[PDB]
Write a protein that binds this ligand. Structure first.
Ligand SMILES: [Fe+3]
Ligand SMILES: [Fe+3]
Lengths: 294, 294
């Protein structure tokens, strides 16, 4: 897609985790950003693979690009982040919400992390705050704090000409599927409602890019929608739904949800900015799986 | 099912792992043994459950029976053993093959076991040897060393009158499915062939009890067959199959197999006689998952 004049957006879909990754480039400077990259991982054998990550490396080189930002909307609990691998091969700066510290505090205790594990977000280059601006070449971008799914959820808006594109993360899905879950630690259905209403306050022709697409059909994969479409036909939080009705709906639905397959391996890796836990005496890195907790 | 006159056998099926558990009771003395019990485990949330195990508990009380043995044919790599739970609930003695020490040495290193983990099979009450006899009430049983799937695989032979019943474990499946795999560390296809031939040297009327039934197509669960049926129609190792021809078949097939879903959490638990890893300082037990080492 090309929004406005110089906003270039490439979408990448991982069927295994239903995760949509993004390559966002300024066409004027050929300088780009990578959002929510997927690190392939098999829970059975405990083996990683940069198969999907290399799809981004090829796309960058094909466009003669230059990575400036490696972004993450939130601490993913459904897949492993490939932010560290991409920074090691394409360079740039990693960035995540400032409230990563709250997440690191909780799961730092759940996994009984080694004393060397930082709870200040030292693993991430830049800690973004609400309404904070940052530059992708000539493209003016802003980081928006939109909690609900997690306490540290951020949304990235990028402007070119008069048109706006917002990368919302795990807040809104396609209008036919609804919204994200709020059964994770720190999550809140009432907070999510407010973050979305604030998101839908944007101009109605604002393009919204999704983090997941579970395909309610039937239909193929879709990643882009508009504010006007969401306000009119979202099955969970369209314009007719007030705060109280959403919360009762959202909370009742979360109780009927199963845990993500890779939630325990994902968080302990994504809280380290995509770094594997440090090797033990035998030089082997291990993922700690808490028993009968969570 | 009743073999001979005083041999009572109850089969139990776990849909998730296709595992077949057994309750073997002596009718006269009303004493019994439990073979390959399953401890329900959810890898997504790290939650254990004794729903299947309690089905064994209430079945014993229904028969007003007494548990003397809690057996395991080998260290399972597809499910968690519920031997410890059943021993704390029903009593008795746990027993396993003497070559448990070999698999505790290898996986004791793979999972980097904490200082205190015994690699001599000390966690098990009795270490069984080849052709060693033991008693379930008045029933004379005998343990046979039948490796190939694992270096410590045992088959349990029990006599009544008259007729012979053998619990082969993971060696022979139903004749329409063939044999077990030999890609697991310590396994060998040629030696498995030899173990099976020993088993098929028994009288043709001898009943064989399987450890798994993966349902080729859809024909309901089947756990019992005969030596004559296996010798005549086993798709992998019937009478007309030479040793060299089997090894080439078996080793080629194992290269086309994925790891079991629960292979990493099961082994590190089953090598502790069904006991979970000792809690850390925060009072939480953790399963170590080795990364890129399998
Ligand atoms: Fe998420
Ligand atoms: Fe097995």
């Amino acid at each position: 897609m090309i929004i406005g004049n110089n906003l270039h957006v490439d979408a990448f879909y991982d069927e295994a985790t239903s995760t949509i990754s993004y390559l966002v480039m300024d066409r004027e400077t050929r300088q780009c950003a990578l959002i929510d990259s997927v690190l392939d991982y098999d829970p059975k054998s405990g083996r990683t693979c940069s198969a999907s990550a290399d799809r981004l490396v090829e796309r960058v080189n094909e466009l003669n690009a230059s990575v400036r930002w490696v972004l993450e909307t939130h601490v993913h609990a459904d897949h492993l982040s490939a932010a560290a691998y991409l920074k090691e091969k394409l360079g740039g700066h990693t960035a995540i919400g400032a409230h990563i510290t709250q997440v690191q505090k909780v799961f730092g205790a759940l996994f009984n992390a080694e004393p060397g594990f930082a709870r200040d977000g030292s693993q991430f280059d830049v800690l973004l705050e609400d309404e904070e601006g940052f530059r992708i070449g000539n493209l003016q971008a802003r980081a928006l704090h939109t909690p609900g799914h997690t306490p540290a959820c951020m949304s990235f808006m990028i402007e070119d000409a008069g048109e706006i594109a917002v990368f919302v993360g795990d807040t809104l899905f396609m209008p036919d599927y609804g919204t994200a879950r709020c059964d994770f630690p720190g999550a809140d259905a009432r907070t999510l409602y407010r973050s979305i209403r604030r998101l839908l306050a944007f101009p109605d022709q604002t393009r919204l890019f999704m983090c997941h697409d579970y395909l309610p059909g039937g239909r193929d994969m879709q990643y882009v929608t508009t504010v006007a479409e969401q306000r009119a036909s979202n099955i969970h939080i369209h314009q007719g739904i007030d705060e109280d009705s959403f919360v009762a709906m959202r909370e009742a639905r979360d109780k009927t949800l199963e845990m993500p397959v890779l939630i325990l391996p994902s968080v302990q890796v994504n809280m380290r900015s995509g770094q594997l836990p440090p090797p033990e005496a035998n030089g082997v890195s291990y993922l700690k799986i808490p028993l009968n907790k969570l």
